[PDB]
Design a protein around this ligand. Sequence first.
Ligand SMILES: Nc1ncnc2c1ncn2[C@@H]1O[C@H](COP(=O)(O)OP(=O)(O)O)[C@@H](O)[C@H]1O
Ligand SMILES: Nc1ncnc2c1ncn2[C@@H]1O[C@H](COP(=O)(O)OP(=O)(O)O)[C@@H](O)[C@H]1O
Ligand SMILES: Nc1ncnc2c1ncn2[C@@H]1O[C@H](COP(=O)(O)OP(=O)(O)O)[C@@H](O)[C@H]1O
Ligand SMILES: Nc1ncnc2c1ncn2[C@@H]1O[C@H](COP(=O)(O)OP(=O)(O)O)[C@@H](O)[C@H]1O
Lengths: 36, 267, 437, 439, 459, 264
Amino acid sequence: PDPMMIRWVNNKMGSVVAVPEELLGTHAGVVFGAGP
Amino acid sequence: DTSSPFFCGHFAETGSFLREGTNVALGYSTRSLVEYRLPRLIWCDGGRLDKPGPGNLVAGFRSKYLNHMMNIWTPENIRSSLEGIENFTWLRFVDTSLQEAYRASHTDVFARAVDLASKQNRLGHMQIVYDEPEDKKWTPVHALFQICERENPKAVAEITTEGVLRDLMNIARVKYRELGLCRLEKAARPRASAPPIEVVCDSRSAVIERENIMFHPAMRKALFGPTPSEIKEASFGPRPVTLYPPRALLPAPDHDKQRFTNITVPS
Amino acid sequence: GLNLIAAHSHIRGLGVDADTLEPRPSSQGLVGQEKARKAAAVVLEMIKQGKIAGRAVLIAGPPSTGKTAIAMGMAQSLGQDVPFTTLAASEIFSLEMSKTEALTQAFRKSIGVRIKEESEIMEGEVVEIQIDRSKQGKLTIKTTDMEAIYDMGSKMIDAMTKERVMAGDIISIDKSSGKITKLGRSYARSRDYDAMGVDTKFLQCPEGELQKRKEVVHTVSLHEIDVINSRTQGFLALFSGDTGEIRSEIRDQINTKVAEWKEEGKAEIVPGVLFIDEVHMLDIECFSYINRALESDLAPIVIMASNRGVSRIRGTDYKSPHGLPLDFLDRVVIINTHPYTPDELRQILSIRAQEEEVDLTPDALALLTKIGQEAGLRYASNLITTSQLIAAKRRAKQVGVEDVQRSFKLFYDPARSVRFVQESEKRLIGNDGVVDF
Amino acid sequence: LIAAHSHIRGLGVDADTLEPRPSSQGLVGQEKARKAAAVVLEMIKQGKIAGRAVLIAGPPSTGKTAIAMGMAQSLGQDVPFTTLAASEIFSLEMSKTEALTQAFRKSIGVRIKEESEIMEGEVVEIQIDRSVTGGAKQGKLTIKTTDMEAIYDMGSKMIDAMTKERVMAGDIISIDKSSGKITKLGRSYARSRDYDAMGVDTKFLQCPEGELQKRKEVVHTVSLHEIDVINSRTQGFLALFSGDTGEIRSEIRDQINTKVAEWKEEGKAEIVPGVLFIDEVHMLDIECFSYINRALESDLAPIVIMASNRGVSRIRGTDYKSPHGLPLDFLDRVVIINTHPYTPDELRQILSIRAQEEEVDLTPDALALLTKIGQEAGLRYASNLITTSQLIAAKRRAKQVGVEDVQRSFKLFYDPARSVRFVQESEKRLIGNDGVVDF
Amino acid sequence: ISEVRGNTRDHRTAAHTHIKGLGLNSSGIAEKQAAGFVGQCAAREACGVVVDLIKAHKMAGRGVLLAGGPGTGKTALALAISQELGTKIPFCPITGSEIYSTEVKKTEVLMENFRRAIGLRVRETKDVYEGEVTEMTPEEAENPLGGYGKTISTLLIGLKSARGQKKLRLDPSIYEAIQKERVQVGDVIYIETNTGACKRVGRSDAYATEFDLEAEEYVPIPKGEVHKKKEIVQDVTLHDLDVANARPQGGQDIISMMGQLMKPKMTEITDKLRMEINKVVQKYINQGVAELIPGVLFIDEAHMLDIECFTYLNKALESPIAPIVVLASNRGIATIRGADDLKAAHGIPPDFLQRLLIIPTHPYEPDEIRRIVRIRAQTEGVQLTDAAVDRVAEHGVRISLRYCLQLLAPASILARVNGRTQVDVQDIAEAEELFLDARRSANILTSTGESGGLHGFIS
Amino acid sequence: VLLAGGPGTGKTALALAISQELGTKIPFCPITGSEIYSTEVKKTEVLMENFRRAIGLRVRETKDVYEGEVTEMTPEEAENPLGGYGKTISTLLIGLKSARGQKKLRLDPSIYEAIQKERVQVGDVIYIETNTGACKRVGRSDAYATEFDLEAEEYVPIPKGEVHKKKEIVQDVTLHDLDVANARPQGGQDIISMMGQLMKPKMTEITDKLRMEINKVVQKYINQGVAELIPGVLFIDEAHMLDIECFTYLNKALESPIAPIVVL
Ligand SMILES: Nc1ncnc2c1ncn2[C@@H]1O[C@H](COP(=O)(O)OP(=O)(O)O)[C@@H](O)[C@H]1O
Ligand SMILES: Nc1ncnc2c1ncn2[C@@H]1O[C@H](COP(=O)(O)OP(=O)(O)O)[C@@H](O)[C@H]1O
Ligand SMILES: Nc1ncnc2c1ncn2[C@@H]1O[C@H](COP(=O)(O)OP(=O)(O)O)[C@@H](O)[C@H]1O
Ligand SMILES: Nc1ncnc2c1ncn2[C@@H]1O[C@H](COP(=O)(O)OP(=O)(O)O)[C@@H](O)[C@H]1O
């Protein structure tokens, strides 16, 4: 539930990036497929 | 037993411990015991050849007609001399513009370095992408004369699979780290420190000029970084926006235990 | 207007026939030096051909005979196309760069790179900035004839924001690079504000079409390419002078790429002329580099002047002809000059009269010819101005015998100054002692 | 490659009696100077006696630099050995005396010992939290050996090293905790079949056993000049490589000497005294000798060994002559070891060693002719004839070199004894101190 | 933009244009009138032995002297060796009057020229994804992390080169590239393999008209591959490694962005750096990756080096990694420039002279100057009759060698001005009085120039 | 004081005898005659720098440390209109927590930049030196101690005592140290004294006015009953290497009212 920190985690299966909900409306979600 | 070098300046001693209990405010009271007493006629009114006050009637005329009218770097005085054997012939081919040259020929070495700090290099990447025998070594015509910017072995070296040339281009750092010259305790230090000498001139203009030159908050902003309020308004917006310190332009200190100070802690 | 009548002002080119190379005597200022002018014409005709690389042409002779006159004649009779470089030898002895590099830069200036291109620029006065805060925008620009509305997408709106363009500016966009260059404001908005700022300069409106495309012929030198590639923002160094010992690997890369541009047909190399005036001031530490820099393909046809007879070479302690080492004089070709007959002296003084728009009676011209034969050219040419001025003080139109004799009485020629020094030795500080009467 | 002193493998004396062997370890053919250099080497290896001066005087091409390199190969890569030439001191950046002071202080090693903490094991997961448009970073690293399962934290520099190394899940990395370097040793799993820009499949190593936090005691040897440069400047480090050190004031050196004495008493550091070799010292002027005689007065001066070539020469910067070009207030301090010219039965075996080093096979008639040439033109012409005759024998496709190859090389390349006659014959087509003519 | 001219792509005539090599046999014996040279047999045989020594990699610090008078062919043999070795072996032709600097000591420019004379060849690989981006489409993970929003497991990029396009699945930590570099649809990028962080080159040329005014560089589509697995040979001189380790090129702070912004100063380099670089180059050679290639340091005019330089040259030549030093001296008994005491042969000290393989150079016979005139005349293209060749050979024997090779250009100019195509005796007899030699110049200087007066020279 | 006599007769043995007879707490500067020929400054500057190395001063100082553990670090920016640089942090609320009585203090921008170039997080013990403004981070406090760590931090306990300490020390400073301190400033938190320690250090020509003003400052120290002056020895070995431009200037260097004894 961090305000502006985007998490990357790489384990033995795969590697996923989690984005907080508070950044999807911002310009940081244009890459992740949310955008303004 | 902690220690520090001797201090030559004039600070402000605290009166007592039992008065300023909890909510106190530290003040930057560091001044030099060496003073230099100037009047308010030379330091403020008309003794400086740069301050355009009355009495110094030259300094406005000379400023305008040497920096903006009779200047060979203003864009009007470049646009007339760009068409042949003339002097700014080459300006079309260097990767600049008229506004780039006009900002580069009036700022400092400092502000020009801050302007270099937000320019993404691309002519090193041309040697990575456009690297075919059929491609005949393509360079943009508006960046043609920047030859040494284009053919650079470092840009090709930073891409290769084995780092056999990246272990040669910065072997000075590896030898400096492997000798333990960062974990070694600092043996020597200066025996006295001092603030810079200031002018004891008793006008308000002198204090304004001191807190705008000796501190000069534009260089402090360009050196230390952006405010967290600026980071919030630049990272919660709907569109990407730039920052005037795009990163903290403080250089990384090359001594890990004791950086930018002279204070010594026992161990 | 920063152009006043110097000594070398009547020499409008070399003044020889371009067909059969016949130096007719009174043509384009120069007078009666037929063999040296023919040899300079042969040199100039093998300069404009530009195939034969790296010669060296010494111009010997007595002083006050015309060795720099023929050099300025060769400089005027090339045009702005082929370069030329007036470098006296005392310019080389610097304190920021060594003699070898500051003499290499004399060779790197006299070779031009010529390239022809099309400049796709857009002048225009801003009328209304229209930003649609929805990214898009519209820019309205006008000239004295046209007016148009061009679309904008994302980022040059941010370039307008960083440039702070108001309604009334004169912007110019180089569409092949895409960067706004604000040229100032217009005279139609000088009535608007009252207390202007510092940075604002007023300009007329742009005229004609917005999209201007033009084929322009750029001509730079190799020294320009060397200094621009020295450091990052290094283009202002060649105006300022804040450059030093440029490494040889940069100049090697630049010569390789200029050869590559000549292969691909982009560039044309135009070799030029280096003029080393008074070459006897160079020491042997400079001739040992000139003897190697006249070997490469990229070396200009060097023309050098000299005055001295059998003199010592600076840096060493042995005499030599022309102040030059003999391993260097085995390499150059020498065009000797000769002193002037009075029939040439009279019309050289007539040309110096008609250049300075000073009218002379024939008796004054004959007297001035005799003074020039007895004292030299540089003293006789310095009496036309003085006689004109003394005639202007007593309000006479034509100068006469009286004004020239007055000018001869006041100012001393160098022939009588030596007798003035040797006449009174006890008061001039010779080497040890002064009497002081 | 094969330089002019690659056959030498030390000085070649005994360890118990230090008698000069007539043929041992390259330096073959001289006994007095090698025994005296063995005594000098033994009092350098003792390390007690400080501030001497050894002057290897003698004719040229007699093996003075060979004896110096013999002492250099005999100390190994432990004791510092500065190969200073006498012309390097005349700088334009710094003064002529401070270059000498740096040249002395480069030859006193300080050997310190410090404990680092190394890790070992298989990375299980990386967890990196990054900000948007500038800001700090957060990091959690889960690592597992065969025994422990740790979840460590990370700072900014550790993440800046992880992203530089691209440490994925399933890597055998070893992190120094103090210095902060990351060396991937290999992998335990295979390469995934889900991503494209992964990399190269590294070495297959198993999971390491033991413990995570292991300790290591490393030994670091720095000269006193490096300590002077890292303690003379606040931020301007790395100038001990790029030579950008302008001047170091005496307040810095007089503190570093005291702190190195304190490190010697505390058992932290050990002072290893070294050798300063000055090749062809006759080029220094008297302003250098007036400091070299007084820098050999303290406990932190290296044992100076230096060479010379000249007879009664005039000292530079003066107007008068002296033996070896050195002043007679400085020749009292020094101790002069003479070297002698060679004998042909020693030149034969020296050329045999130089021929066996450059992989050249000979015939005894060619070796006899080569020794006859080496009697009259020195070794410096004979070794060049060896290499040249090898390649001329390679051009005409012969196995071993012969008399004809040596005569060919002697005909093509003149020795200096014939180039002097070539100068003295044709004096009119050579630039003397005067003019020259052309036919 | 830049208009291309359809002219003739010729070349320029230097003083050593006709030299094309040594011109030897397959056994080393020289042959006269071959590859530009005329005669000069023993010097070309000895230089062929020197060329074989350089290409055989047995030279590790030799030194070769070229004696002989002025105008006999020392620099000609130097350029012949440089064209015989090729281009892939270095060649640094400095002069004696080029070590004197004003930023460093003059015994440092010598060592930097040694490091310019040594080359290092490195063979490596280059694995890059390349081209214009078509899609940036993410993919939702199978197990989203609780407490967050989007959870993206594999990021898809469609890269389109000029030959073929390709879909690419990537690890999601390419996002920090894409936000920081502002990569969009229509921007060419390259993705490396060792790290995997894409860097935008520019907007493509196909999208150069979707807008009207918003312009930047419009780079074209990469006309090549989409997956480069290309190997690279790379030649770096050791001078470049010394400079890049001493003064780093690209940093991210204020003071290194002032160091490259202010003028680059030559600084003296400490010997520990050179020792470390030699110790690591000799390790990468033993791994079998990099090849060391020694070259030639042709120090022309070797009598300008003073006695303080040969002392440093002895140390630098005793190093285990050093190129050959081909000196070039044209003096007899000369005073050495530094110490004005000893009159030594060639300007070289007698201690340094024993290292040198001294190659002589002899004057030319009076029937070989005309062969040099014929070769020089057919090099420039200036053709001329046989009596003209004999007159130029007469001027060559009686005056100088460099002077008979300079009566060919004004004779050709006066020939094609007078109205002919070939040079006759009249054109050379007319051009011999417009361009005097040094001898008649000294005769005019002494005879007519009696003393310093009005119409006289300044002695 | 001239020490004549031929070489090998013990001129400098007497000099080491004097330097071991005076003691440790008296300044003794041994130089040579070839040492003063520099390339940055004129040689009379090197002479005067040696003359003021050979004069010592013993000064008591009262340092005012704030030795705490940082509890809450929160910036408070001020108004910032359109002037190019943007926002600027102007006020803080750093809370220091010692063992006996915490404190919650407020800072200037410059002392915040002193914090900021030290990378002080929440938990780092520091002591703010309120003479310059400097503040050296010591380490993570032991209340946040964890053996599962990687940064190799130095865990120290909470500093006992009051958070606003005040301690006196004795310092041995020569007058040349004060000359170098006031010439090239390296103390404080402004820009001249921060960009002046990133450049390379150069010996410069400390003029007459600084060498007189520092004399008046030292006399102000002595009149407050704090500092003690202890003059010393300049031992110039090999004085014949000095040229006539140095023996000319030694006259005016010895005519000063404060000048150490010269032993040639
Ligand atoms: N042939 C000529 N016709 C006309 N003017 C000449 C001629 N020759 C020389 N002069 C004039 O005489 C002056 C001296 O010539 P210059 O070359 O300066 O002499 P010097 O070779 O001694 O420098 C010049 O100002 C030039 O204008
Ligand atoms: N006693 C020796 N043992 C081995 N090699 C020798 C000996 N004497 C001379 N040499 C060889 O002769 C060459 C010249 O020796 P060097 O010490 O360079 O002479 P100099 O002392 O005149 O400089 C060296 O390359 C060395 O290999
Ligand atoms: N063997 C040769 N064959 C043809 N031309 C030669 C020969 N030797 C010398 N030359 C010519 O002589 C001219 C001068 O010789 P140069 O190389 O300057 O002598 P140096 O080497 O003494 O300086 C050169 O232009 C060269 O073309
Ligand atoms: N009176 C003495 N007692 C003991 N040793 C002495 C005496 N005088 C001189 N020496 C010795 O002489 C050596 C050199 O003396 P030094 O003072 O360096 O000579 P100089 O006077 O030429 O400088 C020293 O090592 C010292 O041990």
